Amino acid sequence: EQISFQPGHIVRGVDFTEDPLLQGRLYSYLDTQLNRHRGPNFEQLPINRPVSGVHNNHRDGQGQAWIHKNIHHYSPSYLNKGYPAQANQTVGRGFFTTPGRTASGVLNRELSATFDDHYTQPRLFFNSLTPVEQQFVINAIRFEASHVTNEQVKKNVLEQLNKISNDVAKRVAVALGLEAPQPDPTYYHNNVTRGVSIFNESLPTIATLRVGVLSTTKGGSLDKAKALKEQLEKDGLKVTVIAEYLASGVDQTYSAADATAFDAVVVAEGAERVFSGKGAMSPLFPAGRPSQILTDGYRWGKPVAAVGSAKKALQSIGVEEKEAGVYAGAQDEVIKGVEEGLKVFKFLERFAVDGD
Amino acid sequence: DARQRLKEVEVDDNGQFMTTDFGGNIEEQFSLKAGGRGSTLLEDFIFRQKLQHFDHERIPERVVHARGAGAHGIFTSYGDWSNITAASFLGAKDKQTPVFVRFSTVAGSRGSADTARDVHGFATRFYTDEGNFDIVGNNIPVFFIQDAIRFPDLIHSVKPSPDNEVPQAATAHDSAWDFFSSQPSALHTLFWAMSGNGIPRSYRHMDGFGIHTFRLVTEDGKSKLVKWHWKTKQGKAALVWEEAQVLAGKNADFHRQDLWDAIESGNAPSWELAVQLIDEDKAQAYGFDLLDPTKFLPEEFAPLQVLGEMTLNRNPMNYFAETEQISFQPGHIVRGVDFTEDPLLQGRLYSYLDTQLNRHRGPNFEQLPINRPVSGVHNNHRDGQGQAWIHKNIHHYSPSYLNKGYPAQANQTVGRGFFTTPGRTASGVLNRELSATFDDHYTQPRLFFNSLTPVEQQFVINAIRFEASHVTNEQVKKNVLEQLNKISNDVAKRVAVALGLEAQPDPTYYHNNVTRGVSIFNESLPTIATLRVGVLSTTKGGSLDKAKALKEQLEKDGLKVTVIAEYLASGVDQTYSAADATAFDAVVVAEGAERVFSGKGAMSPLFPAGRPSQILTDGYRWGKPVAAVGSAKKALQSIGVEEKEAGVYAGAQDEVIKGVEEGLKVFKFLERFAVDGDDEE
Amino acid sequence: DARQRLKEVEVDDNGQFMTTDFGGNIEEQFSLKAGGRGSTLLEDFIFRQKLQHFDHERIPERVVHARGAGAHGIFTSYGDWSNITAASFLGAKDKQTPVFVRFSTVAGSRGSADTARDVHGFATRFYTDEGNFDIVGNNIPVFFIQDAIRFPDLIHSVKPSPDNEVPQAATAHDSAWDFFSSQPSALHTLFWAMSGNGIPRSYRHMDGFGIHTFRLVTEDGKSKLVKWHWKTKQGKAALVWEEAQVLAGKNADFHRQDLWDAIESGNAPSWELAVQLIDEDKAQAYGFDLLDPTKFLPEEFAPLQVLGEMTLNRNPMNYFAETEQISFQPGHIVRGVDFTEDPLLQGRLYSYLDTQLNRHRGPNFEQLPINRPVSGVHNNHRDGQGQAWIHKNIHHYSPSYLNKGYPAQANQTVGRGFFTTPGRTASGVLNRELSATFDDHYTQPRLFFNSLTPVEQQFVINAIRFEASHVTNEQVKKNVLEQLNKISNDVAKRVAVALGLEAPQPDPTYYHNNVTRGVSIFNESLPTIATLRVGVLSTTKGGSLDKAKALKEQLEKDGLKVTVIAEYLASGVDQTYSAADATAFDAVVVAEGAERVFSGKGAMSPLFPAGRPSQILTDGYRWGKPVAAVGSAKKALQSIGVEEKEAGVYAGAQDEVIKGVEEGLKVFKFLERFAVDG
């Protein structure tokens, strides 16, 4: 909470540029520490202290934590013998502004005309995402803009999106009940660039990813869930065994469990008894909670699985083993499948695209 | 070294390159500019981090006692006093505890003169091994008011008028004497402040008082009422008002320079810690209520018992970080000491904790190096502005299974915890009154006046005369007269003369009782070490060689000698232009220097006209020992002083040295001050 | 009434019962206690709200200029100055703007003496109808340093030594003169502070200067370089150092009481606002760079042109809320004015905004009554500590469809917005350097010294002699002499005498004999003696008091403040000898018959310190004041070795003394009583 970042925390060998956003940040971060720490000595706090040593003629201030020896706290001075001494580019490893930087032109309250294109690179970014990745962007916009009560603002938003892509504006306009505007091709283009997409690449490792194992205290499901858990942990996964209560080997109750906590959900064999009938109706958890966890995990694109007879749990929510990211069969097959699925992480086959 | 613990926070910049406050070597003598004669750039991070720290240097001055100075030292107990207190720092003979002491005035702001007339603060912190114990005292044993809720009224009335902020550091204005006359409990402290206690010669020449009755408590819970006393081993000594006034202009740092010089020269000042001890069942047995802070306990009823000695022998390294930032509290109490139901002390406990939030602008001020105890802090406090530690215990609450019970409760029988005096009780109705035992506002002011010497009494009357003559309102002055008349009809009569008001007796509280230990001028000093002699000389003739030999012999006795002349020739410490009699405790004219007291040598571009005659005149008129060697006798003659007057020494070097050193013990020669009735025909 | 807008925040407690800060009538003279002699209860909410507020009264003093006093007034424009500036408060003849001015010293803390020797602040706020415009000036036209990044260095060196915090409000110590000699740009302001400008008689007797070159800008963007000047209508007047030292102890409030009294008695002080105006192309035309704040522009090259007059006629009602809390800023600029590339001014703009965060502990200090503009505040700032308004505009951002564009942008053409001078350009490399045109630190100090009268020069010599003699380090004193030698060989030699050192050989590089007008104090008599003060030394015995009353009545007819002094406060006596000192008066007059307290029995009363009447008269003579005695009282003058034929000493009948004293007060200080080297 106390650490105080600053873009002006710069060292020899680095300099700024005339980026007008950066320029004002340098002022704002120093000044704002005076509010958050109500004093000028916040760099003396342990988490803010440098390791290299502080030697200057600053004194006093609220919460002054040091006692300075040098009583000639000024420069230049004969009485301190020139110490602390000036450092620059040539002596003392001092900071220095880049020697070649020049100023030229009128003092202005303006921005360079070179800044005026606000649409090309939004179009470039959208172009460089996968089709369902693109649909995530449009569905975010659809959700967000649907909260705007003012009609004119919504049309203003559409007018601006239409300058990025006519198809984006058309697809957002449907959610808003607004007309598809006519193409404004000035900034349209089809170029792509690497390194901006998330969903076009599988994960380099699955270590620390979380597997929820839905089990039950009745029968022999928990012993199988423990065996499933110990194998998954060998790959560096964090595995939570879930049941009706905290029996031996249970990490969490159904009452406290949610699919949002896990990157994969697998039903232990025998636990299909909590997905329909009497085992699904219990005072120890909200009605339908095990089915809701599997439904959530499926609908949010996670790897989902069931071992042996627990395939019935997949059937009870209309999910088929045919599907990508869905695994059934015996334990070793489900383990290998779930582990492969975590590399994919999100199975975008389960998300509808406009006109698909 | 009493400052030893502070060495881990000390910063040495010698031999180093300049840096920012976040590291990185820099230059910070030129702003970054857009072109040769261009404007300064916002990206000059070096400029802004430099000037931001400058712009935020100041913190609020103390709401009272803003003006003062302090030093580190050692307290040594003279014995194992566990028969009267469980306090650790008093638990063994020759047990040593580091101290810090700050002295101060009260009314004036941070930059006002040391030699204003005022009550003086005398605050000691003991860094004991069972926490910080503070005795936040004054150089006067009684306070103005009886209930802490009245403190803003007193302080508002003696501080400057709120419309023009006039006058600085002075009680000599309408509102102060309106309050003194409307709130007669104030008359006792007023008399003390009108005496030598109001204009002491130095911090080292003051006694100190806790004022309040406190309690000492033993391990088994038995208690005794106690008054704290500091007895100066340098002797009490005071100026005269007409000299203190000039000194306020010539050297506003007179007292803080005095203490700093005494410590640097190896003449560390000392005070003995002494107590008066009273049985609980005798709290109301000495003619007043010992809960009443407007009273002191006469030593004839309970004598002083010395417990130990404090010696102040280290100056601070950075005044701001140590002296300005230190936060005294009467709530800084330890096992073996307890409070009393004194209604003034009661509210102080709240007020000194609260005011730290204003001065330090955060609740972690006890983490400042000068405020930290040496004994260790272990509790469940967390966060706060400027939190300087990183706590390991994540279970920051009690009671708790998870933290195993630690940090654990300490009380009377476990962990040497603090405990309130076990026998203390409350009885009666909740009330907004004061006990009728507090009613007498005049008897002890009269006892104090009765116990001063005749010229000392005249100093008191002349201070009131000076102060009350500044009161513009006629009725306030008459109100002051009526209240003074209740203490002493003669005092009221003699004050009335100066005010042009009419002199009748009101004898309800009159009496003739005296008590010891409240006078200053009835006793000579036990040592003249560190006292200052100004040797007036000249650069023409042989006077300087003689002045140097005079200085040499005087310095052998521990005196600080300043040889003065027209310019800084070899052997001269100060010029006449820069010299004034207020800086010295005695003035000696070196032989031959009589040439600068008349004729050509007295009119020179190098110093103001008449300056050597003025230094000698001031010195004589202010009661100092004055002297002239050999032919310099003529300088005494030129100002009309005779060679055989008390405290005047003429003759050869050896007898002058001897006479001056004897006169420094007397310190002030009071036959030079007229007393009412002296001028009658 | 200049204070009219402040009347809605004034609070009258007369006729009322005491309350808490949250309402409810209370008593607050007794703590709540458990039993008759019992402990105070935590539930005494009355006690804690009263003491909490007292406990938190103090705010940090100003980092510099901590010691000062101020007043309200009116500024009146003498003309329509639209030909040189778009500034609205200068836009019509007889246009009136409320002002508040604070005067100050620099080094001392809040309780330090007014008559310490120092540079003096002279800060003026115009509450214009287009925002607050501050001229944050000094009583001296040049500053110590050339780049704002060196301000902590200067101030640390002048302020008390950081080990013991000694000395208070004084440059007379090692670190300051080490700095003056290590940083030679400081010598010009140093000389000014060593002159009468360092010990002025009153705030009302100081000129004022913006110091920096600014720009005036017309509606069409044309600009002129400008120097701001305040010219006192009371005349410039100074004390002598040996007098200012005594006055520092006898009345630390000498200057703040002088201004308070003058306003309260109907003697409102006035200053004329005047400018020097030069073209852009003159920035380096006069042998120095006009961006250099260690140089002033001689009036021979550009004369003063008066624009209007300011008169201070209202004292504050609450010092703290008005004088203490007011926050000046050179950034308080309005349309029609612009900055220059003065590297000292440049950094001030950052510093005064930032420091308010420390002094007021929050971002809303402009909302305080003394800081508020009269022209209205409309922007999208919100929240912050102590937010005192309730904003109606919920769309607190721009640009925005939903707020319909309001508040709207204002610039040169729309809405009378501020605008930077359109022709200003930047050229060259980013640099941490100063222009070589800033190099000469000695010519103008010499010019200043050359332009003082011979005794006025001795005062500067004797100030340096006094100051430098406190420097304990031998080499620093030698470095001082080497730097003084570059200004004047004679100055160095005369200074070296007091130091017992040998002055270096002449260094003629910067020597010259040029003089310039308007920088001297003692070469001009005072234009008015109104508000000047006469101490009348009388006695209660005999008929002296009646004559002193008649002498007082006649003197008051010429606008003088008269204090009749005697042994005690008899009828007609203003002050006792015990309370009196010569520092309080501009002239001292012994009333006939009062010679009886200068010798014999009458001089030995217990009612005052020995010799007090003779010391008052002695002090007044030696400090250069007009002194006089009526009739038989000339024995008092003879008792101190002074005689009637001297300049500024008057004797004879009452009619003769009054006429002589009043004309002597115009001269103010008689310089024939001060010895000059040689």
Ligand code: HEM
């Ligand atoms: C016997 C009565 C009193 C004595 C001997 C006394 C003594 C002192 C002393 C010596 C100081 C300055 C300590 C230092 O040098 O830092 C001080 C400060 C102070 N006093 Fe008192 N005082 C008394 C009464 C009171 C009362 C009744 C109150 C309020 C209820 C009060 C409130 C304060 C405050 C708020 C400070 C400022 C503390 C700080 O800023 O650190 N005093 N007092």
Ligand code: HEM
């Ligand atoms: C020509 C040069 C300067 C002049 C004429 C000048 C004048 C003044 C004056 C008159 C005040 C007192 C305002 C008042 O009465 O409240 C003041 C205060 C102050 N000055 Fe300057 N000064 C100068 C240089 C500087 C510089 C170079 C800096 C820093 C870069 C600086 C920083 C400050 C600050 C921080 C205050 C305190 C303001 C406040 O607390 O409200 N000054 N100055």
Ligand SMILES: [O]
């Ligand atoms: O300043």
